Design a protein around this ligand. Sequence first.
Ligand SMILES: Nc1ncnc2c1ncn2[C@@H]1O[C@H](COP(=O)(O)OP(=O)(O)O)[C@@H](O)[C@H]1O
Ligand SMILES: Nc1ncnc2c1ncn2[C@@H]1O[C@H](COP(=O)(O)OP(=O)(O)O)[C@@H](O)[C@H]1O
Ligand SMILES: Nc1ncnc2c1ncn2[C@@H]1O[C@H](COP(=O)(O)OP(=O)(O)O)[C@@H](O)[C@H]1O
Ligand SMILES: Nc1ncnc2c1ncn2[C@@H]1O[C@H](COP(=O)(O)OP(=O)(O)O)[C@@H](O)[C@H]1O
Ligand SMILES: Nc1ncnc2c1ncn2[C@@H]1O[C@H](COP(=O)(O)OP(=O)(O)O)[C@@H](O)[C@H]1O
Ligand SMILES: C[S@](=O)(CC[C@H](N)C(=O)O)=NP(=O)(O)O
Ligand SMILES: C[S@](=O)(CC[C@H](N)C(=O)O)=NP(=O)(O)O
Ligand SMILES: C[S@](=O)(CC[C@H](N)C(=O)O)=NP(=O)(O)O
Ligand SMILES: C[S@](=O)(CC[C@H](N)C(=O)O)=NP(=O)(O)O
Ligand SMILES: C[S@](=O)(CC[C@H](N)C(=O)O)=NP(=O)(O)O
Ligand SMILES: [Mn+2]
Ligand SMILES: [Mn+2]
Ligand SMILES: [Mn+2]
Ligand SMILES: [Mn+2]
Ligand SMILES: [Mn+2]
Ligand SMILES: [Mn+2]
Ligand SMILES: [Mn+2]
Ligand SMILES: [Mn+2]
Ligand SMILES: [Mn+2]
Ligand SMILES: [Mn+2]
Ligand SMILES: [Mn+2]
Ligand SMILES: [Mn+2]
Ligand SMILES: [Mn+2]
Ligand SMILES: [Mn+2]
Ligand SMILES: [Mn+2]
Lengths: 353, 353, 353, 353, 353
Amino acid sequence: CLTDLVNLNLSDTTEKIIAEYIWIGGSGMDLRSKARTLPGPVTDPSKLPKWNYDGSSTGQAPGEDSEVILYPQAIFKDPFRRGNNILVMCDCYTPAGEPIPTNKRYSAAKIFSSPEVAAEEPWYGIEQEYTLLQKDTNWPLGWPIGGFPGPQGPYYCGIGAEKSFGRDIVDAHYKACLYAGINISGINGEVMPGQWEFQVGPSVGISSGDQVWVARYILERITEIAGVVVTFDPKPIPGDWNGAGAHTNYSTESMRKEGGYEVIKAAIEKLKLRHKEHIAAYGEGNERRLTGRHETADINTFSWGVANRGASVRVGRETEQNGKGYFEDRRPASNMDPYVVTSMIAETTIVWK
Amino acid sequence: CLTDLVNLNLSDTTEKIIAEYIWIGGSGMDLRSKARTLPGPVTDPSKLPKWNYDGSSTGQAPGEDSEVILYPQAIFKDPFRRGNNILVMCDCYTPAGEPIPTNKRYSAAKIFSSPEVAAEEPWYGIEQEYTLLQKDTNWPLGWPIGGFPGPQGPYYCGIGAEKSFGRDIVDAHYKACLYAGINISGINGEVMPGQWEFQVGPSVGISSGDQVWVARYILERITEIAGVVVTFDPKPIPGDWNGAGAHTNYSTESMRKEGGYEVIKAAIEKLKLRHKEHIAAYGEGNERRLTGRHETADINTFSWGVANRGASVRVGRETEQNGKGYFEDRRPASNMDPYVVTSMIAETTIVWK
Amino acid sequence: CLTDLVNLNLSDTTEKIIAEYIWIGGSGMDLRSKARTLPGPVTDPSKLPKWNYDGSSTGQAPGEDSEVILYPQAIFKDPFRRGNNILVMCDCYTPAGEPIPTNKRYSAAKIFSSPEVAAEEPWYGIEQEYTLLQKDTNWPLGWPIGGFPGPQGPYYCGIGAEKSFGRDIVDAHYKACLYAGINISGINGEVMPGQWEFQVGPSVGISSGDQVWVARYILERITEIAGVVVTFDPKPIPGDWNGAGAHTNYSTESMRKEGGYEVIKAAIEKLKLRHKEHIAAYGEGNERRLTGRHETADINTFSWGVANRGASVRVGRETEQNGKGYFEDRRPASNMDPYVVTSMIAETTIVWK
Amino acid sequence: CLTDLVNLNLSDTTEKIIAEYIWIGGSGMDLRSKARTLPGPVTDPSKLPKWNYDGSSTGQAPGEDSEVILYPQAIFKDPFRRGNNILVMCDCYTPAGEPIPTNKRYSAAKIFSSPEVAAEEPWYGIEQEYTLLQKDTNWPLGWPIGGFPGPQGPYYCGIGAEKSFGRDIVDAHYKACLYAGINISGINGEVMPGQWEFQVGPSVGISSGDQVWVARYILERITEIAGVVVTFDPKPIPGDWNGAGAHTNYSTESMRKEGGYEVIKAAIEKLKLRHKEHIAAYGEGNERRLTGRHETADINTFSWGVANRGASVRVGRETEQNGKGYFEDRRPASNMDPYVVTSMIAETTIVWK
Amino acid sequence: CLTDLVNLNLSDTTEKIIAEYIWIGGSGMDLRSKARTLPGPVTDPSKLPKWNYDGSSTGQAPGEDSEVILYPQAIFKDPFRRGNNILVMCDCYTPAGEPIPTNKRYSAAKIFSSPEVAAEEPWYGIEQEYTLLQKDTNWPLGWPIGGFPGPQGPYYCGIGAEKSFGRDIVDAHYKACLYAGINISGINGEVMPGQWEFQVGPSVGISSGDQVWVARYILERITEIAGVVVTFDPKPIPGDWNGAGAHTNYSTESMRKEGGYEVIKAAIEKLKLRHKEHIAAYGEGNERRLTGRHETADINTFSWGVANRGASVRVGRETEQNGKGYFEDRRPASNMDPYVVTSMIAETTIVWK
Ligand SMILES: Nc1ncnc2c1ncn2[C@@H]1O[C@H](COP(=O)(O)OP(=O)(O)O)[C@@H](O)[C@H]1O
Ligand SMILES: Nc1ncnc2c1ncn2[C@@H]1O[C@H](COP(=O)(O)OP(=O)(O)O)[C@@H](O)[C@H]1O
Ligand SMILES: Nc1ncnc2c1ncn2[C@@H]1O[C@H](COP(=O)(O)OP(=O)(O)O)[C@@H](O)[C@H]1O
Ligand SMILES: Nc1ncnc2c1ncn2[C@@H]1O[C@H](COP(=O)(O)OP(=O)(O)O)[C@@H](O)[C@H]1O
Ligand SMILES: Nc1ncnc2c1ncn2[C@@H]1O[C@H](COP(=O)(O)OP(=O)(O)O)[C@@H](O)[C@H]1O
Ligand SMILES: C[S@](=O)(CC[C@H](N)C(=O)O)=NP(=O)(O)O
Ligand SMILES: C[S@](=O)(CC[C@H](N)C(=O)O)=NP(=O)(O)O
Ligand SMILES: C[S@](=O)(CC[C@H](N)C(=O)O)=NP(=O)(O)O
Ligand SMILES: C[S@](=O)(CC[C@H](N)C(=O)O)=NP(=O)(O)O
Ligand SMILES: C[S@](=O)(CC[C@H](N)C(=O)O)=NP(=O)(O)O
Ligand SMILES: [Mn+2]
Ligand SMILES: [Mn+2]
Ligand SMILES: [Mn+2]
Ligand SMILES: [Mn+2]
Ligand SMILES: [Mn+2]
Ligand SMILES: [Mn+2]
Ligand SMILES: [Mn+2]
Ligand SMILES: [Mn+2]
Ligand SMILES: [Mn+2]
Ligand SMILES: [Mn+2]
Ligand SMILES: [Mn+2]
Ligand SMILES: [Mn+2]
Ligand SMILES: [Mn+2]
Ligand SMILES: [Mn+2]
Ligand SMILES: [Mn+2]
């Protein structure tokens, strides 16, 4: 029946290829996509045709002047259609070639191109935490309707049918991402029951944002299959339950080299000064997350420390002991735009003085 | 058990083949089919025997003179029975060789054979929108019974279990169509929840209508497997919900060559003059769809524009900018007979002055 | 779990074979079977041992003298057990070598051996119509309990979840039958919702009866897997709903040769004279079917005509136009014994004057 | 628990009274109501205070000028709250004393006051047919979901759990109407399963319209208790199922006196001449009901006859044989406004020449 | 809520009365009724108005000449509406005063008026057996779907949840009938599970038929309330399960007086002679009941005996021992028309020689 058809191997019958064009909609947080047939395999982004879509259905264009343009930027293998089919992360433009206001890749790309940034070759490890919900009731997976599971404690990295909710989805996503070519560094179950995490492992400059977005796309397509809902809301349940962040781990060339630790403290120092303006771009609703409790620092203070999960920024024991490595910006919410967060960190850290 | 037998590979046991003969029934909108065993593989339509059926059971002949004749016209591979089995799009005649009144293939074939049309080598891209319904209640897939989902907005090209209903069926159809040999160019999720679209990519003359009908047959067979219902009704839910069109994209030899844009405007001009008569053949119920809202033009006016989804006809930014390409007739309803629409466009556009 | 064991491939472990001996029970309408292990593959009926069964449990013998004897007559591949396992159509005899009263194969074999019949080499194509029922309620598949679907119209050769009920079973049976080696010429969905048809394609003399019985066995074993019931009752639902025939298509050597049409009319003429006595053997309950409505002729009249589905006998347009072919006896009920009907037609048509 | 409170007898504790003010909403077909406490029992309409409501929530006034005024016209006992509590049929006016466009009681009252009409003292017997539906699916009570009961025949005036659906509601409404003071002349089960009827027995002039509206109000409140829905749609199910009328039986002083039959034919004659204009005011959707089949006359012809349920107007055998009585106008749909229909009949029949 | 309204006591608010007019429809076996409001209490049939109904909806008149007339013949108290409300058993006529073909009361009344019959003052005791079915499946109450309870034996006059199905209905009916004024002589549970019986105790002439029909009306109204179905089919389940009769117990003046036993035998002797003709009028389907088994006599033989439940006619031990009493005609089926059976017995027994 139905999976026989979804899983048909096309290679036996044509050279033709399906490409799923993915872009970001009007809200800056909604992923959209559609698919087209291409005459054969393609491995290079610039050999893919540009395309358009109805921007008036995605809050990005008026009905009378409706076309918005898609620029292929990155190709991944499609873990759903498989074979030689592909996913294509895109970028949005007016027909005149202007980037639309919700296109944040463009600015970010500029910054990562700028030669004093490219020289420093910045690395990002982003930790995407999210929460699984039951469809329709919108109540976290594995929670009884109108009630609560036992208090936090056993759920973090836990095992067992009463502790761990949705591993199916997580493991499927892990492999799907690896198969697609995403640099996914690992996964864990989080503190709040029904909450999980994956890491997009050290990725350079613009490709970090590209990868996180596609990772997100893949996640949500998987939950879709499973009949479950995902939120990237930073604090889906009020009270004594963890919120969801997108910790950004960061290092430059000079930070991972001998006596890098000194560059790190300097970079932290710059971040301290631009705290306010980073907060404003670090995802909406973050006030409900960053309270100083539940392994967050208060939104209003800035702090840093060594193995300190209460601080705005944390430096690993490992990198302290080696006088070189990376640090962790814990401030960004799970609904953060990685293009924005990632480039803004480069800018505050290299360019600005 | 049951899928073991449905999916038996016959190649291991005979050379015999199964052919599913498909035709259009008394309503002009109802697909019918039955199957016969043939001695071996066949790749050419004209090497298939003719056949008949009981026309008195399909509203096409009286009981006393019941036989109606099937002319094989197009062969595709059967994505359900797989192996060497085939689907066979047919054409209906009286035993005297007359095309019956519901046979619209015949006229259309005439027009596409006529040499000044064939010279122009017309291309059609038809965008089949349709809606998925729950069996028995006839209420759209994913909608709560006697209620409504959230307003339009997030559904168009959306992902997620709360946004996207029926992707299973859509992806299955996609591959089944490609495997079968249909020139399907792409798919997207539409504006109304539960509404979807596939495109029968640029196809020449008569084979456009053949391919759309078979595409439809395959869709409805797939929904049948899934226990879900399809309508091609152009406005299945009244109120603030999109209707369903079958946009017909169109280009001639001279339209896709240098300074083709002028030929396009000329063609549009001709269409403006025969609006009334096209409307009459553009599918029934269209009055309930073409209202000027929900990305339609009002039935009574005719208009055109560049990136204008409010217009009767739209021309891509792409083809404007290159002074050559195709245009989109947005007027035909989802329940349009592509034979009638496709040929009538050629006729108003090439033959008539 | 359970299908892993049912689908075990025995070829990897022994040369041993399973043979399912099929026979006809005390009612003349009830198929029975049991299975024995045989030392290795067998392709010829006469190399299979005879066997017996408890006739006192099938209405065919008393308890004190309970053994009845099975004579292998035809071999087919077992589509259930697969590998080298086989189904074996049988014939029933007293231990003294007498055919039992419910054995109608014996008479039929006699007639088909008789040299003036064998010379004429008669061909049968029987159209087995049947109805699928919900278990326990015995109400047709797809019909709401204590209610009715929409009126007849859309169901004949239809597609769609609202029109087409049980295609699963029908498609599985089609392949099962092909794999088995039954000469199945095709299938269609019938006029009454939940009613279906298959054809056992042109088969010579005694092997027509053999194949139809085995086709029936295979059908009912499939319905058993699906948890659905089949009737061959000629009129399962009173009122404005089609009954179920087993149309017998027929032709002799001389009918399919030049000026065969004349032999056909002559044959029809002879049938007209023995209408009463054919009816009496054409299946019980037929009075509820043959009413002159729903594509039958009244039991009391005999008539014939060209494309006439209201007649007792029909001749295809195709065979009229070519002055040679076959004709359709529409009179037999779906619960007809094909041994009786098939041989009686030969007898009234060749032997008797 | 809950019925203990709904059924509390207030007479034991205060003299206070609850009055439910009923009026007709912006669509002219939607009943609305609210309740207020009054210091003691009231038996005369003119001793009740006027009141208002938010017209902007009923499509009868803008938000900035929202008040619409209610004029008490008739009092009935409240069968729900019981005791001395009352229902109050109302009339709607601008604060300036203008009747609003949806107030059709005003015109009707004028006509029934006019002295040549009051002299003739017209009587109305209106037969309100309606259909019960399952909540959410909107499919008729007692029908299986996505299916149909057996054909019409046994349902009209039938008894039995398989024939009769919703008697509870009907019998409760019968008594509730009698207790309230409505002159309800009787009830019957109608032709279509789930369809029922009550008659508002001979009522003079304006009180006929008042009583039918209140009878409707009571009905719908009862269905609300039972968790069932009512339509007054004139043809709720397409096809071979009866529609719903509101036959208006009519007689004047001179029609019920000696040789009244002659006056009757004359009146019928005047109605024949104004058929077109009556139709236009006889309820919307009537085209779907008045087809000439299912005991209707075609909308386009006008006819009359003695015991003729095929006619536009019918005269009883009883009144023919006595040369005096009344006649039945069968034309009005069940969603008819009885104020409009009732007065329009008086006008065409007495006033106009 | 709903029973509060159905059970409203109207005596507190008007003198008005509800009268349910009951009649027999086109099949001769289907009860019909509707209700009208009357100005006050009525105890005498001849003071009730005649009425009519739509005969074209009950198979008793054409649409163009649709009125059929109802003559009140007997009054009973209405056990559903209670208070002073009434049931009214009616008789059907053309507007010309002719009894319609399905009116069997008329003939019967003639016979019971004829003075040599009235002198003899005949008494009837009819034993109405019937069977309770589950709605929709039509399978007997208490029987598992698609299965059978334990064999007959414990059910006849049994008690306990596993033996006795529907007593609710039966005890309700008993009281309702007594309250209504029907001369119900008693009840018992019958041999077949879900089968029951009541007796309409010694009633004179025409009133026997009247009372049985009303008892039947009351029964089916009660089953309606319970959501269960009744058949009066004489053999609802084939096989080793009892059928249902309507035994008619009978005596004349001279049979209940001294040496009445001689008159009895003489009467039985006359019945023997007209067996064939009685059978023809004793209800349809009786061939399936009267088999000689399950406490019946074979249809083709006539027999009688003393305590013999295998005989066509039985005489009680009591009346044998006293040489005077009554006898039991066991031949009539449960779907018998008591008007026909009752009068035909008087005729064969008194009038004919
Ligand atoms: N030098 C580096 N610069 C930036 N990111 C790094 C560097 N080294 C490792 N990472 C990445 O940082 C992320 C650390 O993730 P995780 O181990 O989940 O953080 P935590 O230890 O707080 O949970 C990983 O994606 C990892 O691959
Ligand atoms: N020159 C052309 N003539 C006809 N069809 C074309 C031409 N170019 C592309 N097409 C086809 O037209 C269809 C494009 O419609 P679609 O992708 O749904 O765009 P939109 O949604 O904006 O109307 C596809 O079938 C595509 O292959
Ligand atoms: N000459 C013949 N003799 C016997 N059977 C034949 C002959 N020619 C065709 N047939 C068979 O008769 C059957 C035709 O059945 P079908 O198409 O169901 O009949 P219908 O015309 O009633 O649709 C098939 O078995 C076909 O192979
Ligand atoms: N003279 C009359 N004038 C007006 N209405 C009358 C007159 N006599 C009786 N009626 C009313 O006419 C209505 C008859 O309705 P109904 O019993 O439904 O008739 P039918 O079903 O035959 O059309 C009742 O309300 C009854 O009270
Ligand atoms: N003399 C009589 N004439 C007519 N009916 C009588 C006479 N005596 C008693 N009956 C009635 O005969 C019926 C006997 O019914 P029941 O007791 O069910 O009989 P059985 O013993 O056959 O079951 C009762 O209706 C009883 O009132
Ligand atoms: C376990 S946690 O400290 C908790 C993160 C928390 N959900 C937050 O709001 O950032 N994340 P990690 O330890 O992986 O850095
Ligand atoms: C989004 S829509 O514009 C809307 C079509 C709409 N369903 C209609 O009725 O035409 N389809 P497309 O954008 O592919 O042209
Ligand atoms: C559509 S029908 O005519 C239906 C015939 C009906 N079932 C009968 O023969 O009883 N059968 P076919 O078309 O195969 O001859
Ligand atoms: C039985 S009917 O004739 C049918 C009325 C139908 N519903 C109509 O007027 O469309 N009603 P009535 O007998 O009350 O006049
Ligand atoms: C027990 S029985 O004899 C059974 C009668 C059976 N139902 C029949 O007459 O068909 N009824 P009763 O004892 O009242 O005469
Ligand atoms: Mn982490
Ligand atoms: Mn974490
Ligand atoms: Mn971290
Ligand atoms: Mn499109
Ligand atoms: Mn579209
Ligand atoms: Mn389009
Ligand atoms: Mn056939
Ligand atoms: Mn058939
Ligand atoms: Mn046939
Ligand atoms: Mn009426
Ligand atoms: Mn009516
Ligand atoms: Mn009426
Ligand atoms: Mn008894
Ligand atoms: Mn009994
Ligand atoms: Mn008895």
